[PDB]
Design an enzyme around this catalytic site. Structure first.
Site, PDB file in Angstrom:
ATOM      1  N   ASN A   1       0.835  -1.211   0.000  1.00 62.93           N
ATOM      2  CA  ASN A   1       0.000   0.000   0.000  1.00 62.93           C
ATOM      3  C   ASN A   1       0.868   1.259   0.000  1.00 62.93           C
ATOM      4  O   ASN A   1       0.669   2.171   0.807  1.00 62.93           O
ATOM      5  CB  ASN A   1      -0.957  -0.005   1.206  1.00 62.93           C
TER       6      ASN A   1
ATOM      7  N   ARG B   1       7.818   7.032  -1.277  1.00 64.38           N
ATOM      8  CA  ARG B   1       7.697   6.730   0.155  1.00 64.38           C
ATOM      9  C   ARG B   1       8.482   5.481   0.580  1.00 64.38           C
ATOM     10  O   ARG B   1       9.033   5.442   1.683  1.00 64.38           O
ATOM     11  CB  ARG B   1       6.231   6.575   0.559  1.00 64.38           C
TER      12      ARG B   1
ATOM     13  N   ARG C   1       3.921  -1.535   9.056  1.00 61.89           N
ATOM     14  CA  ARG C   1       5.006  -2.307   8.425  1.00 61.89           C
ATOM     15  C   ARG C   1       6.170  -2.568   9.386  1.00 61.89           C
ATOM     16  O   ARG C   1       6.863  -3.588   9.272  1.00 61.89           O
ATOM     17  CB  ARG C   1       5.523  -1.580   7.177  1.00 61.89           C
TER      18      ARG C   1
ATOM     19  N   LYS D   1       2.400 -11.711  -3.252  1.00 60.90           N
ATOM     20  CA  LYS D   1       2.996 -10.569  -3.971  1.00 60.90           C
ATOM     21  C   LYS D   1       4.457 -10.328  -3.568  1.00 60.90           C
ATOM     22  O   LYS D   1       5.354 -10.311  -4.423  1.00 60.90           O
ATOM     23  CB  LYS D   1       2.132  -9.314  -3.760  1.00 60.90           C
TER      24      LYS D   1
ATOM     25  N   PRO E   1       4.891 -11.255  -9.803  1.00 63.98           N
ATOM     26  CA  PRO E   1       4.243 -10.594  -8.668  1.00 63.98           C
ATOM     27  C   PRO E   1       2.902  -9.955  -9.040  1.00 63.98           C
ATOM     28  O   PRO E   1       2.865  -9.046  -9.881  1.00 63.98           O
ATOM     29  CB  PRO E   1       5.262  -9.525  -8.262  1.00 63.98           C
TER      30      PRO E   1
ATOM     31  N   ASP F   1      -0.405  -7.955  -7.926  1.00 64.98           N
ATOM     32  CA  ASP F   1      -1.316  -7.113  -7.154  1.00 64.98           C
ATOM     33  C   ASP F   1      -2.032  -6.174  -8.134  1.00 64.98           C
ATOM     34  O   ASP F   1      -2.070  -6.464  -9.330  1.00 64.98           O
ATOM     35  CB  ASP F   1      -0.551  -6.370  -6.047  1.00 64.98           C
TER      36      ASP F   1
ATOM     37  N   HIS G   1      -1.368  -3.518  -9.713  1.00 64.27           N
ATOM     38  CA  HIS G   1      -0.616  -2.957 -10.837  1.00 64.27           C
ATOM     39  C   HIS G   1      -0.613  -3.857 -12.090  1.00 64.27           C
ATOM     40  O   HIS G   1      -0.796  -3.339 -13.192  1.00 64.27           O
ATOM     41  CB  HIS G   1       0.815  -2.604 -10.415  1.00 64.27           C
TER      42      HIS G   1
ATOM     43  N   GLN H   1     -14.743 -16.868  -9.499  1.00 63.55           N
ATOM     44  CA  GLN H   1     -16.119 -16.364  -9.622  1.00 63.55           C
ATOM     45  C   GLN H   1     -16.206 -14.839  -9.654  1.00 63.55           C
ATOM     46  O   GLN H   1     -16.684 -14.267 -10.637  1.00 63.55           O
ATOM     47  CB  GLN H   1     -16.997 -16.898  -8.483  1.00 63.55           C
TER      48      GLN H   1
ATOM     49  N   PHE I   1       5.974  -2.829 -16.488  1.00 65.43           N
ATOM     50  CA  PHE I   1       5.965  -1.970 -15.288  1.00 65.43           C
ATOM     51  C   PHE I   1       6.777  -0.703 -15.507  1.00 65.43           C
ATOM     52  O   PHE I   1       6.285   0.394 -15.271  1.00 65.43           O
ATOM     53  CB  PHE I   1       6.491  -2.730 -14.056  1.00 65.43           C
TER      54      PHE I   1
HETATM   55  C1  LIG Z   1      10.018  -3.304 -12.633  1.00 64.59           C
HETATM   56  O1  LIG Z   1       9.678  -4.654 -12.394  1.00 64.59           O
HETATM   57  C2  LIG Z   1       8.895  -4.994 -11.284  1.00 64.59           C
HETATM   58  C3  LIG Z   1       8.691  -4.114 -10.207  1.00 64.59           C
HETATM   59  C4  LIG Z   1       7.925  -4.496  -9.081  1.00 64.59           C
HETATM   60  N1  LIG Z   1       7.801  -3.441  -8.132  1.00 64.59           N
HETATM   61  C5  LIG Z   1       6.586  -3.188  -7.341  1.00 64.59           C
HETATM   62  O2  LIG Z   1       5.642  -3.943  -7.407  1.00 64.59           O
HETATM   63  N2  LIG Z   1       6.531  -2.058  -6.445  1.00 64.59           N
HETATM   64  C6  LIG Z   1       5.353  -1.680  -5.667  1.00 64.59           C
HETATM   65  C7  LIG Z   1       4.730  -0.456  -6.420  1.00 64.59           C
HETATM   66  C8  LIG Z   1       5.634  -0.001  -7.555  1.00 64.59           C
HETATM   67  N3  LIG Z   1       4.716   0.913  -8.241  1.00 64.59           N
HETATM   68  C9  LIG Z   1       4.223   2.196  -7.885  1.00 64.59           C
HETATM   69  O3  LIG Z   1       4.454   2.813  -6.887  1.00 64.59           O
HETATM   70  N4  LIG Z   1       3.373   2.648  -8.926  1.00 64.59           N
HETATM   71  C10 LIG Z   1       3.339   1.638  -9.947  1.00 64.59           C
HETATM   72  C11 LIG Z   1       2.662   1.575 -11.195  1.00 64.59           C
HETATM   73  O4  LIG Z   1       1.821   2.642 -11.599  1.00 64.59           O
HETATM   74  C12 LIG Z   1       1.976   3.116 -12.908  1.00 64.59           C
HETATM   75  C13 LIG Z   1       2.819   0.438 -12.014  1.00 64.59           C
HETATM   76  C14 LIG Z   1       3.641  -0.614 -11.605  1.00 64.59           C
HETATM   77  C15 LIG Z   1       4.308  -0.549 -10.374  1.00 64.59           C
HETATM   78  C16 LIG Z   1       4.156   0.589  -9.537  1.00 64.59           C
HETATM   79  C17 LIG Z   1       7.052   0.212  -7.082  1.00 64.59           C
HETATM   80  C18 LIG Z   1       7.568  -1.035  -6.340  1.00 64.59           C
HETATM   81  C19 LIG Z   1       7.305  -5.755  -9.045  1.00 64.59           C
HETATM   82  C20 LIG Z   1       7.510  -6.648 -10.133  1.00 64.59           C
HETATM   83  C21 LIG Z   1       8.298  -6.275 -11.237  1.00 64.59           C
HETATM   84  C22 LIG Z   1       8.510  -7.273 -12.429  1.00 64.59           C
END
Ligand SMILES: COc1cc(NC(=O)N2CCC(n3c(=O)[nH]c4c(OC)cccc43)CC2)ccc1C
Ligand code: NI
Length: 316
Positions: A140, A145, A195, A240, A257, A259, A261, A278, A310
């Site tokens: 979250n 941050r 956290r 995740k 991963p 979630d 996004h 479902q 991403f």
């Molecule tokens: C680069 O490759 C990976 C990066 C992660 N990093 C990750 O989940 N996090 C949690 C949130 C992330 N995040 C935002 O703060 N806004 C984001 C967004 O909005 C446009 C889209 C995608 C990730 C976002 C930054 C770290 C996970 C998996 C892969 C393969």
């Protein structure tokens, strides 16, 4: 006292690795939410900690230039051969990203379009401990941050390495430091909120219940699914976070991963909806299904493809 280097300021102190821009674009990789320890302290010059040492990185179209700050009052000099091998394995440069891009592109018209603008988006091979607790901080939460939380955590609990200009660099703490009786309260005061409990708890759990950092090295050689289940036993580590660690620190390139996004990307850009599950929105069964969807489509480097998207989804 000492200052951040550029390639013009101190050209003697740099060394180079042959690496095209098609295989690695620093600016896409180091700010895509894989690592939260890298900052563009001057233009095209990315500084950050890497295993109790500070590096600065810059690049040309076909060369990756890098320099090392050793912190202790030593003679400044260029990177050693072993230090360049550390950086080669960090970027996983053995793997040809060109061949991976085209392979994913052959079954994915969306990827093919995105792959034009965003080349050289590779996965970092991160320290398991640093990766684990960074992604406990990510729930979250956003890149800005998370970076803050992790920078303060290292200043408080981790050893000092060097100061360059106003930036004091600290290595990542060992598990014992984060597991102490005051650690949750210190971490709350440092702004982690709920956290903080998971950080202390998982540190304590890895030591007492699993035997310390060697357990994370065992998970490197274990198969993906065993490692994932093992990580999910930890406080604050679900599917995740466990996948993020599998993908980014335990050499499981198939880890996807899932979630909100990828849900957004899957739905908007691939027209995906959970078929077997479902309810129309996120759930543990539907999330698992979405990971299988992308693995089925892209193959055993499914996570590396996700990073490219991403990275593209973060840039407007
Ligand atoms: C680069 O490759 C990976 C990066 C992660 N990093 C990750 O989940 N996090 C949690 C949130 C992330 N995040 C935002 O703060 N806004 C984001 C967004 O909005 C446009 C889209 C995608 C990730 C976002 C930054 C770290 C996970 C998996 C892969 C393969
Ligand atoms: Ni729809």
């Amino acid at each position: 006292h000492m200052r951040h280097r550029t390639l013009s300021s101190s050209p003697a102190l740099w060394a180079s690795i042959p690496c095209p821009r098609s295989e690695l674009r620093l600016d896409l990789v180091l700010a895509s939410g894989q690592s939260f320890r890298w900052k563009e302290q001057s233009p095209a010059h990315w500084s950050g900690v890497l295993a109790d040492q500070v590096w600065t990185l810059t690049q040309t179209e076909d060369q990756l230039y890098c320099t090392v700050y050793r912190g202790d009052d030593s003679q400044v000099s260029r990177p050693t051969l072993e230090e360049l091998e550390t950086l080669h394995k960090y970027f996983q440069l053995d793997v040809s990203l060109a061949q991976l891009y085209s392979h994913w592109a052959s079954v994915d018209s969306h990827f093919q379009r995105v792959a034009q603008k965003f080349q050289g988006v590779r996965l970092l091979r991160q320290d398991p401990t640093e990766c684990l607790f960074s992604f406990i901080c990510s729930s979250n939460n956003n890149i800005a941050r998370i970076t803050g939380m992790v920078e303060r955590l290292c200043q408080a609990f981790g050893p000092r390495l060097i100061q360059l200009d106003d930036v004091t660099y600290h290595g990542f703490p060992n598990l014992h430091a984060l597991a102490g009786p005051e650690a949750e309260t210190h971490l709350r005061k440092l702004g982690l909120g709920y956290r903080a409990r998971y950080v202390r708890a998982s540190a304590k759990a890895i030591l007492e219940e699993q035997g310390g950092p060697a357990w994370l090295q065992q998970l490197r050689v274990a198969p993906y699914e065993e490692a994932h289940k093992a990580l999910c036993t930890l406080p604050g580590v679900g599917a995740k976070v466990a996948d993020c660690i599998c993908l980014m620190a335990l050499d499981k390139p198939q880890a996807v991963p899932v979630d909100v996004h990828v849900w957004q990307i899957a739905h908007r850009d691939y027209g995906w909806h959970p078929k077997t599950s479902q309810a129309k929105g996120p759930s543990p069964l539907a999330n698992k299904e979405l990971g299988n969807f992308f693995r089925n489509l892209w193959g055993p480097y499914a996570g590396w493809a996700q990073a490219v998207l991403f990275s593209a989804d973060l840039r407007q």
